[PDB]
Ligand binder design. Structure first.
Ligand SMILES: NC(=O)C1=CN([C@@H]2O[C@H](COP(=O)(O)OP(=O)(O)OC[C@H]3O[C@@H](n4cnc5c(N)ncnc54)[C@H](OP(=O)(O)O)[C@@H]3O)[C@@H](O)[C@H]2O)C=CC1
Ligand SMILES: CCc1nc(N)nc(N)c1OCCCOc1ccccc1CCC(=O)O
Length: 186
């Protein structure tokens, strides 16, 4: 099992979702970036594993469920089995993490990506250890009902550059955004 990472797209006012959808109109390339980063594994014969809350799983278009080429794990205390199309189900972030260390997954899991939502991000981000946050900054305010938790810049260092991550401003549907990578080790 490799590194633990969080990936999210957030508006200026820190919004990540609204009514089960993204606060902004769909951005094709932003989604492709998300697919690329979470899918790409730097270790032959292995796969990355994505962890997400129940609401995030159901917010993803069925056409894109499960997230292809990745082991999909959903967090929920209500569900009795992984949702149709999902691979695994865990009742807490720790359990999901332990699970990757089982003989079952242990040898096939490379990177672990937390892809949402709020509660999962928060717990992971405030957990001691090595952790990277891949943050897409949608440079506009958008009415939202779900938000990204605070990034403690004393711990999380914004990297000056990162391989495979464009550093310049992007724009789709008249909306500008940029990619950032943060890293902490505590
Ligand atoms: N812009 C972006 O990057 C992203 C946007 N989103 C968007 O955000 C919204 C969904 O986010 P959100 O509301 O935060 O919902 P979540 O995806 O985090 O799901 C919350 C639910 O998932 C389960 N859950 C979360 N954490 C845990 C845990 N640690 N252990 C066990 N179960 C857990 C619980 O379900 P249960 O009650 O059954 O126990 C809970 O009710 C949607 O609007 C979606 O479109 C989502 C991801 C990324
Ligand atoms: C592509 C959005 C997105 N972008 C980044 N950088 N990180 C995420 N974790 C993320 O969330 C991915 C999981 C939630 O996905 C959705 C939630 C609501 C509506 C649509 C989608 C995905 C499909 C698309 O944007 O076309």
């Amino acid at each position: 099992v490799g590194s633990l990472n969080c990936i999210v797209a957030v508006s200026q006012n820190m919004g990540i979702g609204k009514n089960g959808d993204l606060p902004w109109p769909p951005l094709r390339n932003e989604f492709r970036y998300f697919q690329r980063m979470t899918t790409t594994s730097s270790v032959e014969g292995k796969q990355n594993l994505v962890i997400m809350g129940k609401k995030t799983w159901f917010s993803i278009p069925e056409k894109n469920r499960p997230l292809k080429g990745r082991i999909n794990l959903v967090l929920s205390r209500e569900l009795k089995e992984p949702p149709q199309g999902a691979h695994f189900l865990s009742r807490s972030l720790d359990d999901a993490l332990k699970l990757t260390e089982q003989p079952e997954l242990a040898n096939k899991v490379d990177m672990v990506w937390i892809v949402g939502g709020s509660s999962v991000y928060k717990e992971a981000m405030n957990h001691p250890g090595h952790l990277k946050l891949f943050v897409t900054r949608i440079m506009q305010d958008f009415e939202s009902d779900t938000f990204f938790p605070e990034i403690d810049l004393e711990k999380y260092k914004l990297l000056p550059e990162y391989p495979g991550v464009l550093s310049d401003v992007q724009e789709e549907k008249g909306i500008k955004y940029k990619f950032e990578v943060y890293e902490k080790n505590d």
